[PDB]
Amino acid sequence: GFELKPPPYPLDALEPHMSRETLDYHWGKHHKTYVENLNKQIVGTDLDGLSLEEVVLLSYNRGNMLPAFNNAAQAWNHEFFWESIQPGGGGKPSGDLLRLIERDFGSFSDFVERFKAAAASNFGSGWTWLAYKANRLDVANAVNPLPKEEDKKLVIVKTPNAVNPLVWDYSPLLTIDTWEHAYYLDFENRRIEYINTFMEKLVSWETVSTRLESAMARAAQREQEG
Amino acid sequence: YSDSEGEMHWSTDVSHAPEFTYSNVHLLPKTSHLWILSGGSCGSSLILFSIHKDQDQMNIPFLSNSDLLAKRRRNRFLIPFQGISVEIPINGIFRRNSIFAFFDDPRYNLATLFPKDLFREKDNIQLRVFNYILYGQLVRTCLVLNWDEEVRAFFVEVNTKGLIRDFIRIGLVKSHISYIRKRNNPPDSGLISADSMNPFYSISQNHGTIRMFLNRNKESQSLLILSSSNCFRIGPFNHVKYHLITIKNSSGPLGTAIQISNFYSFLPLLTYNQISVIKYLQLDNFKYIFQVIHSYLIDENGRIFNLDPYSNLVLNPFKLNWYFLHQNYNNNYCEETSTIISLGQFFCENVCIAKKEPYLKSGQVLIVQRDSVVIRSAKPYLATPGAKVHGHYREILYEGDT
Amino acid sequence: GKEGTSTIPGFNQIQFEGFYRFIDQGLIEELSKFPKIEDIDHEIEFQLFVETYQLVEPLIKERDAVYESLTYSSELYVSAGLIWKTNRNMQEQRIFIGNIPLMNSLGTFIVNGIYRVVINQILQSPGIYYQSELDHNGISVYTGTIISDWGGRLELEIDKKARIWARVSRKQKISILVLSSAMGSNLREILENVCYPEIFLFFHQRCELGRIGRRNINWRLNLNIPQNNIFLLPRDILAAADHLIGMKFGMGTLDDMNHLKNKRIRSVADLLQDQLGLALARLENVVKGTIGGAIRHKLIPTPQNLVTSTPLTTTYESFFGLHPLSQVLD
Amino acid sequence: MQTPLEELYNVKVERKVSQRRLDELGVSRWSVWKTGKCKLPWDWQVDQLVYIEEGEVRVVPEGSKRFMQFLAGDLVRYPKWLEADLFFNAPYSERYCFKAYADD
Amino acid sequence: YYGLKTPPYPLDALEPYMSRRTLEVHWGKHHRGYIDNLNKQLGKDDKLYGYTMEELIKATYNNGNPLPEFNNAAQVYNHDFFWESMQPGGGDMPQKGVLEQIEKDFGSFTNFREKFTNAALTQFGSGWVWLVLKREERRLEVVKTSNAINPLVWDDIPIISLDVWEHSYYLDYKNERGKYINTFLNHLVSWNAAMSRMARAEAFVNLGEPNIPIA
Amino acid sequence: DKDTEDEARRRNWIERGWAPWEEILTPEADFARKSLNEGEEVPLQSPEAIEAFKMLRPSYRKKKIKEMGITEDEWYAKQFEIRGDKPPPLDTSWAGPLVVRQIPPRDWPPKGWEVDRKELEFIREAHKLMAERVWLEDLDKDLKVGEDATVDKMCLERFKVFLKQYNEWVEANKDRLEEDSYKYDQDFYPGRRIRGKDYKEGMYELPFYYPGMICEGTVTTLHLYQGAFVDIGGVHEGWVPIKGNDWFWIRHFIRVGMHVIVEITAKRDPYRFRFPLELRFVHPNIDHMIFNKFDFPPIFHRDGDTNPDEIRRDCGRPPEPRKDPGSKPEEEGLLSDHPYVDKLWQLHVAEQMILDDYEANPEKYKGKKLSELSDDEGFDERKEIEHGEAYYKKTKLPKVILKTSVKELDLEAALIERKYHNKLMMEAKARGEGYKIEKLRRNIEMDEYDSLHWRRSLEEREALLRDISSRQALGLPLEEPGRYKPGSFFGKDQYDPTSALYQYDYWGEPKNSEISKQERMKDAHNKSIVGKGNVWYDMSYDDAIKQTIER
Numbered sequence A: 001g002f003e004l005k006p007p008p009y010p011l012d013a014l015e016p017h018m019s020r021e022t023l024d025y026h027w028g029k030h031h032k033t034y035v036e037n038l039n040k041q042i043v044g045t046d047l048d049g050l051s052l053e054e055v056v057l058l059s060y061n062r063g064n065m066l067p068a069f070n071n072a073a074q075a076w077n078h079e080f081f082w083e084s085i086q087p088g089g090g091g092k093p094s095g096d097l098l099r100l101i102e103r104d105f106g107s108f109s110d111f112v113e114r115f116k117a118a119a120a121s122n123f124g125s126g127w128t129w130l131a132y133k134a135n136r137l138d139v140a141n142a143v144n145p146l147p148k149e150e151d152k153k154l155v156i157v158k159t160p161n162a163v164n165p166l167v168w169d170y171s172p173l174l175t176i177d178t179w180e181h182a183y184y185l186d187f188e189n190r191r192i193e194y195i196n197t198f199m200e201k202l203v204s205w206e207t208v209s210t211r212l213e214s215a216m217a218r219a220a221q222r223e224q225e226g
Numbered sequence B: 001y002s003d004s005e006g007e008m009h010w011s012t013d014v015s016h017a018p019e020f021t022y023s024n025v026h027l028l029p030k031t032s033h034l035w036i037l038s039g040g041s042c043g044s045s046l047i048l049f050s051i052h053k054d055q056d057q058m059n060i061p062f063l064s065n066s067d068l069l070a071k072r073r074r075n076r077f078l079i080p081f082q083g084i085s086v087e088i089p090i091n092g093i094f095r096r097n098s099i100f101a102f103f104d105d106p107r108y109n110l111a112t113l114f115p116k117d118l119f120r121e122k123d124n125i126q127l128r129v130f131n132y133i134l135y136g137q138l139v140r141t142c143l144v145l146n147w148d149e150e151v152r153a154f155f156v157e158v159n160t161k162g163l164i165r166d167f168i169r170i171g172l173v174k175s176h177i178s179y180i181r182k183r184n185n186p187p188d189s190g191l192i193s194a195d196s197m198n199p200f201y202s203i204s205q206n207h208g209t210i211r212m213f214l215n216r217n218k219e220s221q222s223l224l225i226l227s228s229s230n231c232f233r234i235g236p237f238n239h240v241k242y243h244l245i246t247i248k249n250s251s252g253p254l255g256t257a258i259q260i261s262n263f264y265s266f267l268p269l270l271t272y273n274q275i276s277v278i279k280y281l282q283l284d285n286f287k288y289i290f291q292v293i294h295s296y297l298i299d300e301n302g303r304i305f306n307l308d309p310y311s312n313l314v315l316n317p318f319k320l321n322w323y324f325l326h327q328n329y330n331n332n333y334c335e336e337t338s339t340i341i342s343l344g345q346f347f348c349e350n351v352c353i354a355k356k357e358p359y360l361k362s363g364q365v366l367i368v369q370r371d372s373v374v375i376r377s378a379k380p381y382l383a384t385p386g387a388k389v390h391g392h393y394r395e396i397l398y399e400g401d402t
Numbered sequence C: 001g002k003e004g005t006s007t008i009p010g011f012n013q014i015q016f017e018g019f020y021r022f023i024d025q026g027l028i029e030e031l032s033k034f035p036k037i038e039d040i041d042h043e044i045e046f047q048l049f050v051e052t053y054q055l056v057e058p059l060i061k062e063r064d065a066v067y068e069s070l071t072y073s074s075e076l077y078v079s080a081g082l083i084w085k086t087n088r089n090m091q092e093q094r095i096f097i098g099n100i101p102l103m104n105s106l107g108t109f110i111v112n113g114i115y116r117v118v119i120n121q122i123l124q125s126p127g128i129y130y131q132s133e134l135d136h137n138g139i140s141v142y143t144g145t146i147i148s149d150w151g152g153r154l155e156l157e158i159d160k161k162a163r164i165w166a167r168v169s170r171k172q173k174i175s176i177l178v179l180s181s182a183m184g185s186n187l188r189e190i191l192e193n194v195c196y197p198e199i200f201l202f203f204h205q206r207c208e209l210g211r212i213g214r215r216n217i218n219w220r221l222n223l224n225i226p227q228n229n230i231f232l233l234p235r236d237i238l239a240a241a242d243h244l245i246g247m248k249f250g251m252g253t254l255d256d257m258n259h260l261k262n263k264r265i266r267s268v269a270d271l272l273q274d275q276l277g278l279a280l281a282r283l284e285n286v287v288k289g290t291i292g293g294a295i296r297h298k299l300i301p302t303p304q305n306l307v308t309s310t311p312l313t314t315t316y317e318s319f320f321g322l323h324p325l326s327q328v329l330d
Numbered sequence D: 001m002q003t004p005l006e007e008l009y010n011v012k013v014e015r016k017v018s019q020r021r022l023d024e025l026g027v028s029r030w031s032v033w034k035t036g037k038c039k040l041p042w043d044w045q046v047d048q049l050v051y052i053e054e055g056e057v058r059v060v061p062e063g064s065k066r067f068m069q070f071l072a073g074d075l076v077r078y079p080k081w082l083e084a085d086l087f088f089n090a091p092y093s094e095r096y097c098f099k100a101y102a103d104d
Numbered sequence E: 001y002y003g004l005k006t007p008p009y010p011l012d013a014l015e016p017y018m019s020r021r022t023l024e025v026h027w028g029k030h031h032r033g034y035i036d037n038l039n040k041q042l043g044k045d046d047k048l049y050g051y052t053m054e055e056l057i058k059a060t061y062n063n064g065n066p067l068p069e070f071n072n073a074a075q076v077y078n079h080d081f082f083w084e085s086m087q088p089g090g091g092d093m094p095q096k097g098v099l100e101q102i103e104k105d106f107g108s109f110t111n112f113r114e115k116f117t118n119a120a121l122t123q124f125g126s127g128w129v130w131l132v133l134k135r136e137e138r139r140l141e142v143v144k145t146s147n148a149i150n151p152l153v154w155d156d157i158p159i160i161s162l163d164v165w166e167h168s169y170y171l172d173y174k175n176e177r178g179k180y181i182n183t184f185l186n187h188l189v190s191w192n193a194a195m196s197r198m199a200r201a202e203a204f205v206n207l208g209e210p211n212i213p214i215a
Numbered sequence F: 001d002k003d004t005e006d007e008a009r010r011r012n013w014i015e016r017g018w019a020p021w022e023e024i025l026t027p028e029a030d031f032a033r034k035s036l037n038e039g040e041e042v043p044l045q046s047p048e049a050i051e052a053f054k055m056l057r058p059s060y061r062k063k064k065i066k067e068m069g070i071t072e073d074e075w076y077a078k079q080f081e082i083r084g085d086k087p088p089p090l091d092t093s094w095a096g097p098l099v100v101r102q103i104p105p106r107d108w109p110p111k112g113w114e115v116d117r118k119e120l121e122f123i124r125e126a127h128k129l130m131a132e133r134v135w136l137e138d139l140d141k142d143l144k145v146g147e148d149a150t151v152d153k154m155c156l157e158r159f160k161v162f163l164k165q166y167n168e169w170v171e172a173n174k175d176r177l178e179e180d181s182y183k184y185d186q187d188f189y190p191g192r193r194i195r196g197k198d199y200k201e202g203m204y205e206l207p208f209y210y211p212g213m214i215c216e217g218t219v220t221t222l223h224l225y226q227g228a229f230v231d232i233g234g235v236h237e238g239w240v241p242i243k244g245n246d247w248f249w250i251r252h253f254i255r256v257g258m259h260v261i262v263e264i265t266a267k268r269d270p271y272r273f274r275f276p277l278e279l280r281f282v283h284p285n286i287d288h289m290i291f292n293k294f295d296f297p298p299i300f301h302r303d304g305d306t307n308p309d310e311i312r313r314d315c316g317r318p319p320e321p322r323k324d325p326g327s328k329p330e331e332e333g334l335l336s337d338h339p340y341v342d343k344l345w346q347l348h349v350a351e352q353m354i355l356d357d358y359e360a361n362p363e364k365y366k367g368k369k370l371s372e373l374s375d376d377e378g379f380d381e382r383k384e385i386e387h388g389e390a391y392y393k394k395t396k397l398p399k400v401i402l403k404t405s406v407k408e409l410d411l412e413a414a415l416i417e418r419k420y421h422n423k424l425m426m427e428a429k430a431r432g433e434g435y436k437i438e439k440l441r442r443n444i445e446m447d448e449y450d451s452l453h454w455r456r457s458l459e460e461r462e463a464l465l466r467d468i469s470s471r472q473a474l475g476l477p478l479e480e481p482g483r484y485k486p487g488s489f490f491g492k493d494q495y496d497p498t499s500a501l502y503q504y505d506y507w508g509e510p511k512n513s514e515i516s517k518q519e520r521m522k523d524a525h526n527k528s529i530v531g532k533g534n535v536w537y538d539m540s541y542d543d544a545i546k547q548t549i550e551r
């Protein structure tokens, strides 16, 4: 039921990089099918378009994998993926992330090499995520009697097919579409170039920071609400 | 009645269809013999079907401010021993809602009974502190333990340099059927109970093959044991009657057969049968279907070598030279040997192979070799027409069974 | 333990072994069956502490007992509990229930100065028995019968594909098509899990099989119910028709009621235990009668005052004097 | 001869692993689990990569009477669905990181 | 230590239903990359080395917990099985035993094609489409397996394999997987290949019926 | 329904493994079957019965044998001839010529037995040659026949190097392997190592063989329940898995003594698997007459096979199934019960036990420092978890005694804490108050040990969740396959007291119920303390500490 949000940048913004005709099918074909299938599957269900993010969580059904889940996750994944890239790209994180990756992944140089290796090692079609970890299990003894600041850290999670860290109660910050359709059309099968160009020419740290300044706001209330 | 454990068998003259279509009873239109193939029945011991399968050799037999001293653990707890007096049954079992401590309060709120551990695991035991009235001291409280399997109480002692302290624990020893997912093993405290597990830090015949088959009328495979008490060897006799830069022919490997791209199979077929040709042949390999074996050997350099392409010639890998095959392996089957005794056939007690050879004991031919034959003991029972055979084919009968 | 393995066993061992079993095991078993005493709820509660039972050697010797025409017997003492909840105070006393007759090593009792022996009785064992039956015209109807420790006669006969009669008595001719739920069981949830169900398309008198019956009902019907359970189960009734149908097709054989495996021998141990149970059954009525009189007069009686030696002594004297099995020693 | 329990239960063992491996694995960032002489029955519902710093741990698979001796400085990867116990006789601490499917 | 086995046809022989350029990367890069990675892993371990292809996949599968070498080991077999499953001038319609078995198990080929296409379409993400023979059930089956999973892990014998990995069709059919699936079954699938795979499978399943004596 | 005498017979062959095997009857037994058909006591009219009657005299047997021209031993051999219709003759047609490459076995070298790695890598290069594409069309091209086709024209160097290594290994292990055969295999059987005088030099060991190679051999023994065994010139005979009534037709073709061309299907460990060389006939082709298949190859059960899981793990057999608990592992509560805390609790008690005694009376303790204190005598013979039996005034209860050596105690840290906590109560006594201490230094170190164990259960659980979806999205099993089979698999009779089938609650619980009898006592026992009291209020124990602290 949800409308397909166009990417917040012109379709011809990264021609010296991944071309528009690739995007004409990655967004105009792949993403259109994902959203329209949801419109054909959420016609009269119990949800009928409550909120897109919780639909993936609701359709997750704790691993039961309802049929609408795959299109729902892909719709959010690609939509989240479009925001992750701006025409400028590259650069380095600005302050807010720097206090984290340095204390979690040693250094930015260590992190980027680790991030590229994780995405490259991702076998088959899937997604690689850099997600803030603010997990809260709905089970006995889940709450830590002595919470610590370093307990909620940044983790690099590689997920197959269509599954996002939202099902782990994590808050994704950035992701790379390691599905072959995202990168196979232009530079053949060189996923390494796809990962390199994504990190050095396409990452939007400011967008990640905006999606990170929200991360420790959903996290900023859990410890004080109780 | 059967005089030995074994499996039912009849060659013929017994109605395959039962008398009624719910019973293991068969009628004989003609008189015939019912054979009981002797076999050890190990039905008195547990059989693990994941490890015990057909034709397995069995070299081994089958099986068969004192508060801070307490502790709240998983479905158990310890308490100091002598105002929290302890009440216990004669043998000691707290079924449900039973009290184990009252703590009579003279003032008529509760004093802590545990060191308030920082992690509250989801235990089945529930502790409740019911306050009674006794009139209608009067508000003497009580300690009630409840679960949702039986608790057991037995005091443990901490010996150290002579001095002694008593400690009563109350476990939740269950039926052991719920002890899945070994994490959930109160046996983590079971060793301090009546257990004798070695810490591997200070601890420092029967034969027979498995004759197991699935009788679908039982939905459970039945087991027989074939050993030296059932199968015996008949004495040796002559029953098999047989009908160039090269070395003598010797039985051995020819080398790995590479796959043929014309047949696009990773492991080459190398052979069709009568059914296969009229079922699997792509109307293009007919030119290659030969009735005679043609052997080709290639080297690491890709060169194709055959020697004479008219006779069965192969290379011996161990001695690295060519030699002839035995009989050219013609497509049409021809009799090479002819054994007097065929495999799987039965005979009675006094059948004679020849004049010199002694008589053959009753049984079924189980193993056929070049000279000797191994027989599985069988006991034929003569049955007249109109008799009723109890049991389906290959059904296990024990001693005394009708 | 290896008594008769090598030598000829003592001729009185059966009498000897039975009595020791009765003293060792047949006393607490019946005493444990003695219930609590209370009317509804008042300043009264009476009970017996079974674990504290004691037996005292008789004062009189065997020669004195026969010469005086007395009964050579031991005295049974059990601690009893009484509380008056209006006072809410516990009164405890070691009461004297009565006298338990003692036999000598030769296997003979003396009651009122006469040597009496308790001969052995042979009865049909509790369990399922499949036996054919013929009628005025001849039906050859296979019949399954269930016997309990009370001599139950729950017959279950098959009239081919028609109903399965379950007459408890001769006038109780009743089917089981609608008795699927019956006592507390259910509808066709497990009835169709064995063979075919197309055929379908009291509290304590004879309802428990006992220790012996559970073994036999499992022995024939091949049931996984543990021997610890005593009460009959609808699974057992369900399995009764299961093997009953097989007899129609020729599988299995009819039980021979004259076979000793179908018989049970009850010795002096069994009979003395039964009379003890009757005595306690008469004893609980005495205390119930006593508390009614005590309440009606409003006096504070000791636990001894609530009991008398009559229920225990009289029943044994009646047993030895009237029961056909208790014969005068020849 | 019977096969050793190591490859029988496909438990990866990397004895006296060189310092190069410990870097890219982030062993310095693995959680610490320290214990003394005790017995820890357990069943691995997920793959676990355990590095041992001191002491030694003897693990017996459930139903077995043979133990697997792991010394200090080794790397042990307990696979999924493994039912066993963790015995100890000396103060023992480990750095571990449970790994999901294709995690790393 | 397995060489990169070339397809039984030149890379340009699949035109126009398959561009040779996509073959140059699907077989020249993806398959060869799988070949090189597997060979490096086999050099480390002498236990995995020495396993046959069918045994190596099943052993590395580890009963549902694949070893790190499984992905490379499974893929090299799948890609090798994929090239032989296709041939120039392929497609058409199977005959003889393969046709009889498909009719016997799936009712009709058109029923099988619908079952085959639906399994291929519903396969989400990277995976393979397998026409396999069940050892215990003694019948043909269509199974969808994601990523490198192949029915050898369940002892099933593959007969026809279809690669629905996005690298196999994107350069020619992009998002039109259905058309790519259809042209595979119409002009690419080698039904002659299935018969030979059936012949080897027949050596282990015996799809025939016995000849019970009258006596 | 029913079953005619054509499908029940078919069902018997397929499911019951029926086969009309020949019965070689004696003249007395043959006469019984031919004469009881006619009745009980009647003149025999059937010529078969009449002839069977005359054969009861072996003298009459001689006349018939003499008349038909038989040496009286062919007749004894004729009676064993297979009766019934013969199967159609086999016509094994080769699928083109067989092309053979002398490829060294992949599994070489054997377990252990380090060899020249440089030579080994040279050998292993031949394995990559398997991928070479070979067509029957380009086969006669550059074909060599005769002198040019001799061995001296062949490279075979990678195979030759393997032979050099193989021969060296054979010499160093010929005696070692033979002794193991005697040590483990009591009796020689087809498929076991040929030992004793029957062993001949030159027999190929198992590492010489590898699946996929073609061998020429002769069948030496036929086993009805196992199959035919082929001698392929090795120490262990090859095995072809032919089982059951399939032999009824195969026995006409596969007969002992014939020469066959066979293909090695699998090679296994001879110690575990009893038939280490699993074979497959390629001439004659029997694949169209083999309907009974071994799901798993038969294995031994050696002396040390105590753990069933080890046995099935050594081979490829599935694990032992168990009843599924029905509870999702991920939704189960986390565990914080660190096992060492229970042991650590014993040490904590001992620290307070010595200190309390030391503080109580200034005994001989002053002679030796607490840290300097040594253990007593006889601590070795204390079994340290030794059981026992005790009995109180009213109750008889089991007792367990736990010794604790003074070596594993931090007395100096404890006594300082003991004194420090002792120097913290007189202030309360200075104000007339209690001094219930929150926790002791031993207690807090239990908290971190539980915290460490809880942390292990935590990060595992979240990693478990991530593992669930990856397997769920990929079809991989969440739990171990084979293990945790569905319900009703374990037989048909399961005692379920919850189910009304096994329920005995017809009209209330009978007074003779052991549960009810063992319920009224708890009714008596719990009311032996309170009597006819009434419960004012009731709540769980966790809440019973909160309001007292809040006071």
Ligand SMILES: [Fe+3]
Residues within 6 Å of the ligand: A030, A078, A177, A179, A181, A182
């Ligand atoms: Fe994508």
Ligand SMILES: [Fe+3]
Residues within 6 Å of the ligand: E030, E079, E163, E165, E167, E168
């Ligand atoms: Fe592919």
